[PDB]
């Protein structure tokens, strides 16, 4: 009977569009926070966060008020979309193509006037998202609210801090702080300024899963490419292996090429690894021609020059310790032996070729390793978070 | 005549604003259930699942009540959304874009007040999906129902058991069961307390299809990879069978990658499965150029070590059970017999040579097979459910 | 001026809450049936129908009935959503996110109170699709309507028969039927019973575009496979052909993958063919590797067991119908032409070893071309629907 | 003061419900007609067709009239949804999920009654898309408009020509027409016949970007299988070509698979020219083996048939253009010369067999490239649009 | 008090229908301009662009003024959607399914009655993407704004420079300028006029991403088909090189193919370059099956044409700087020898056509190195945005 008595009493001359305050020269003061309960989704090829949020803001209605003597019981009503003042408050940079994606529930009033809502909902906002440093990467995602209609003079925006005790966990994502800022600021639209309050996600992607999935695959790939010095070049395969090393890792610069946006803002360490990696996996295949055209040598071609013969079979070989009937049948016989030995001293030439390209192959299974290891501890120990993402993650 | 002269006077005075108890000072008690008729979709990637379901609330309207007798016939009314006081309970947990994807239907009313309202509904929440023991995983998805307005002090929350009767087996998800438990909790908005009811949907995953179409083909192409050391040295062939095995079983990585979510939270089995099959195969083309090498060496290069001679042509080769003109033409026949005499000797040396690629080769088989064998059995019965899926899925 | 009189006449204390029947005890009879326009989709993997529907309602409206002498030429009026009772029937087994598709419409009503009202819809609707006997198989996909609150004893559902004559024929689906049949189901929620129409859509898969696309295909790149056992080994290409052919396979494989459920009710046809094909293809590179390695046996190893040439060389080669200073120069000359003797019979002995691999090589091709027919043949003729998929699609 | 007052009278007991007539048992003329602006996707997996239209109907209001003297300046007034009778016009055969895509705008009314209605939309169609001839195809899409809920008898529906003035063209299909045409139809539900306008959508498809793209790759890498009868079979690499282009090939075969519906009406163009090709790939791989076999066969096997000796070395060649201790020592000595002897006319029986390998790779060379030539000529000219699309697009 | 008592005021007799001139003879001035946030995508193959814009509509209100003395402190009222007049502005060639995204906001209103209105959006506009020169390209995306319903006589549009200060850069295009342009256009619709106003788009595509990622990448891959004219024949893998090269380029054309349109309007750059690429790298594999053929001649076939013999071993070659028991044993003897001298002079005759080969291959090698840099350097420097984005991107 009091709660019936005191609805229709709240809501007699009210006005929804009438901002709620006692004096109209004066702001009405509006309390603004979050509550963060999930990060659902980080997309870096649309540069979108999705995230669960319950936003809180609070306020004093100076209409919905009443003595709770004279209605024993009733301590709180509510009141739905429309039927009160509410605060409009939007998500500046929202990706979401309603553009405004919170769900409306009640407001609650207490017998002083004090106003509670809290609606829940599915944000989509915009936020650079850096993939420099990818996977090794911090993001800082800003999200923007404010009163779209009222001004500073208005409406008087404040902060509180941003609620995370019911954060959930992301697998993907280490969370490190939600903090705010209020601002002011005036825009060309109005003479007035407008606040926000913005809240800055900054989260530590976590690196174990592409680790395992994305990195490691390559260095194993790209260590059997540098196998190909250690093939003998009769075995008839040295190109076979080069090349088909080659085309996987083709596919797999492609298949990062689905998560990577197409911006241009810096070179990401993820490409440079590729890109280091494929031209070593390339050169090596220049350099396994080279090799096989030393063992293939004709032995009655060109000479062998000295700058070669020194080089190699001397410098670098030591460096890797490597190291009258009776008259004619005279005549057959001494064709045949002759024959034979002209063959044999062919064949020393041909052995030299052969050991040529041993000592090549050789020295370049050498110079590859090192350049192999030296840009891929290079590259990954660049980011700044790389050790961190060790200690924390593996 | 009674319908129309009853909804007429039902509704005079009435206010959906207002919470239909007759003692304001009391909590109107609110039963709350659920019917699960489906699970459409476990999304593992993103984490979400999808279930048609039928909430179930029921209370008592104290204004909503009528004489059975001054209306003969009209045992029971109907209100739509809006014309009637409601509960708001949510999913506090959604991940749906609206957050709110319940139908809103009539409420039930019957002559002494009781109220029923069945609101179908896809709902699409969110819950920690652990892929660690994928495929052989069993996942536990909560769903967390509350009213988002009146806490504890107003409306009392009290829970029912889920109703299965009508539920749609699903081919790849076994229900195991889904029971609810009713706890109050507060939150840091307000110092009421706010009750909530949880049901927590179990399934365990039906593994006969990824046995089938990821297991067992992974295990065949594997062993493929270990007929390269039966595959003789002069086929030519040895390096191309390796790394093309190599090339495939990365793709089927990749094709692994589209479906498991990129989290952090441990290695999963399949993850484990792959990276040891990874190295197996990868080993293996290490050591076919080992093989290569000794099949390929130069008879005039270094001499085959003492520790060589021993470890691999007496120990590993017992233990595998492989076990004056007539002058001048005697100098020029005499040099032709000789020729023939050095390279037969050479040949020799090459044959040891040969029959030592040949010892490792079968050597390196048994070791291989061995640790295929092992890895495979120990990977895949880590699983604390791989007895119970191949019982009842096999 | 009549049009008017009785659209006023007509909403006089007219109450859409209230079912319109005269004698309040008694249920309002519904007519309901459908007209099927389209099959829009069959979606296998997330097992969903989508099709064209015109739902068909009609019942007696008791209030609004008019004289038409009094009202000359106004036969029929009109209402829209709101302003008039309707009953509220949904589809039960929906898979749409608003739950209800129906785009709401006008109800005609005469003027002896027949009201028909035509909602046309895309629905989703949920169905087991059996992939067992893909892509020879039929689906009975159902669609359960009935009203959401009103039980047998206020609402009377009846049937009749589902409109195909403005049926559009989908090139995939070849419609078989839409019987319906109506029952009355009890629920935990209510001791009433609730009565349903339930129309079984039944369609049969058309299979030339997977015959030409998925099945021939398949076929033709498994017999290049047995090709191999016709390569003579000295092309030392038997390896990279079978290899070759197996990659190829495994990615069809996967294509087959993206279009099936992950479900574990049974084996698919299609699963089945791909995995017989696949052994196939693999054991025939096991045996290329026996082959090769007899074809590869050093002559001075071990000795040809009894066991082989009795089996191979005689029996299955027979069914294949297969088949001073003098005597110092005679010292020298001698050795030479021993020599020359030593390396005829050894080679003799490699003919031998050649020849088993041949008639192995034989052997096979003969065995495997048997069992791929037979294991193509059996599987494809295995399904129900096989004999008149080739009749009728053929 | 004009514009307020007209405002005022005009509804003055207007009912949005009644069909604006003066004389209720006569048919209101509604002229429909539409704005082709653009053309925005054909999808012809899902058979379904997206445009941006403005709808056009215009109709008299008997209610809405003024004498504009007495209303100085006020020659139109506007109304949007709900205020003002509309006729109900929706298109018949949409795909779109909430069934009517139209944007609801205000009607425009002058002083004599004549309204005005242009929503814009953008419309999802479904029409049966076919691609026999693809992708030299021209579609037939048909739009039915018709009033839902008013018959023939109520609603007169009338047509006028479509506008295309202001039609953006589409990249991909060039719009040939769009002509209408008005028919009344009888359907189940009801006796009274309902008239509709239907639009035909004629549109063709754009070659040059499937020519570029899917043509003519397909014949270049075709012309590459050929190459094989070119290749020396000593090079060892007839099989690797081959086979690597029959992989290459499956792969584009699955490329179309992702654009192409999968119905049964016929054998798409595209299809045949992919069926054509992949078997004289396929046979020229078997051809290979054939000629492997003769260029490999061992001299002392079987003995070349006198059927292959005088087809191929005579007649296929010709039209071709190919074309006491010194008796022991004259022992061994003979030997030696005898054994020579032995070997020459047994590599000149291999020379016999290599050749004929030859004249058989000249033979399926010219073969093939003929097969080739026709096949790919034969099947491009069969469809009707093909001289129209080398004009128009090359 | 004065806030309610203005409010209540205000809304009066208020018509939202009525145009809010005081001479309704006179059309109502509004102003519209627009505020670029984000280009949030560039949608190629669908041809549609998505921006966050914020709207400026701003227009004066006769009714809506007020004294602000009898009003202390109520400066500014606000009013929400259907509770006053504004203009029915939309998006002309709208992408969006609803056809307008526009998120509806408050109206700001002053004392003198001027209305300010700038409600957000995420915008989906269709625009021409000219992919001619992608991906050195400019694109021109217009957004046409105007009233629906009201023509030159009602409502006179006016513009204003749009507004860029709140822009966000976006990583993948470089915002050249927004301007506008209004204008006044006739349609077949109505004799009045409608004015528009169009602000063009234009925006830069930043190259470095598709530079290291798409060009590079496939000319360094092109590079390594040219190393086939460096690896020796006898090496065997002259065929393998080239064919796998050519796999590998084919999927990247169709990884270029999943981001470009399939219109006819031009050939792009990017389809010229992988063309040009192709057919290169196939000509390769043409060469050097005739390479090998002259490699692997048989010396007892034809005889090495004059022509070939002048043109190659000379000409080309130099410009490349290349270069009675006694009795019967002398017949025996005099055989062995004989037949050495045979085999020698067949081995000389090969190895001309050895280094036929050889001079071919080092001819092909330079030629298609010249072609292949000439065909890159000339596609690439077409395009007139090429010199300006090396400059700003490199
Ligand atoms: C430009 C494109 C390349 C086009 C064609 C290939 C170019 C080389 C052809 C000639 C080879 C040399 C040869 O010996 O040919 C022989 C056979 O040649 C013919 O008679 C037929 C040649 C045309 C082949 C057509 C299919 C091309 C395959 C598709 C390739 C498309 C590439 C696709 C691009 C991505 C000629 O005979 P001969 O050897 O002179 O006989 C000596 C006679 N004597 C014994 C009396 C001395
Ligand atoms: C506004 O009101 C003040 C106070 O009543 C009065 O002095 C002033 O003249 C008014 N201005 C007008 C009527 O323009
Ligand atoms: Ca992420
Ligand atoms: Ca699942
Ligand atoms: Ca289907
Ligand atoms: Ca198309
Ligand atoms: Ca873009």
């Not at 809501?11 to 509550?35: C, G, H, I, M, W």
């Not at 409406?155 to 280490?174: F, K, R, T, V």
């Not at 690894?273 to 096989?292: D, E, K, N, P, R």
Request: hydrophobic content about 45%; proline content about 5%.
């Amino acid at each position: 009977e009091f709660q019936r008595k005191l609805y229709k009493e709240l809501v007699k001359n009210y006005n929804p569009l009438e901002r709620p305050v006692a004096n109209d020269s004066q702001p009405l003061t509006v309390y603004f926070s979050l509550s963060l309960l999930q990060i659902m989704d980080v997309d870096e090829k649309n540069q979108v966060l999705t995230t669960n949020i319950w936003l809180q803001m609070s306020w004093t209605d100076h209409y919905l008020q009443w003595n709770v003597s004279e209605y024993p019981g009733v301590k709180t009503v509510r009141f739905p979309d429309g039927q009160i003042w509410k605060p409009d408050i939007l998500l500046y940079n929202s990706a979401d193509e309603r553009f405004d994606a919170t769900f409306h529930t009640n407001v609650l009033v207490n017998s002083s006037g004090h106003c509670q809502y809290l609606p829940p909902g599915i944000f989509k906002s915009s936020c650079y998202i850096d993939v420099r440093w990818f996977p090794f990467d911090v993001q800082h995602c800003k999200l923007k609210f404010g009163s779209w209609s009222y001004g500073g003079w208005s409406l008087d925006l404040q902060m509180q801090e941003a609620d995370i005790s019911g954060y959930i966990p992301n697998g993907e994502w280490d969370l490190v702080g939600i903090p705010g800022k209020r601002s002011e600021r005036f825009y060309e639209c109005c003479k007035e300024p407008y606040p926000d309050v913005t809240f800055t996600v900054t989260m530590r992607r976590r690196t174990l899963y592409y680790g395992l999935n994305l990195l490691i695959p390559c260095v194993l790939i790209s260590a059997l490419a540098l196998l190909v010095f250690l093939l003998p070049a009769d075995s008839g395969e040295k190109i076979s292996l080069g090349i088909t090393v080659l085309l996987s890792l083709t596919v797999f610069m492609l298949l990062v090429a689905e998560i990577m946006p197409a911006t241009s803002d810096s070179v990401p360490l993820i490409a440079q690894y590729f890109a280091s990696t494929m031209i070593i996996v390339g050169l090596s295949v220049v350099v396994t021609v080279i090799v096989l055209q030393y063992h293939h040598h004709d032995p009655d071609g060109g000479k062998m020059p000295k700058w070669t013969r020194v080089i190699l079979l001397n410098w670098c070989a030591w460096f890797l310790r490597m190291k009258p009937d009776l008259a004619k049948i005279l005549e057959e016989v001494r064709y045949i032996a002759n024959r034979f030995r002209c063959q044999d001293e062919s064949e020393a030439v041909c052995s030299e070729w052969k050991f040529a390209a041993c000592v090549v192959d050789r020295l370049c299974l050498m110079a590859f390793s090192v350049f192999t290891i030296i840009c891929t501890i290079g590259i990954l120990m660049s980011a700044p978070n790389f050790v961190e993402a060790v200690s924390k993650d593996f």
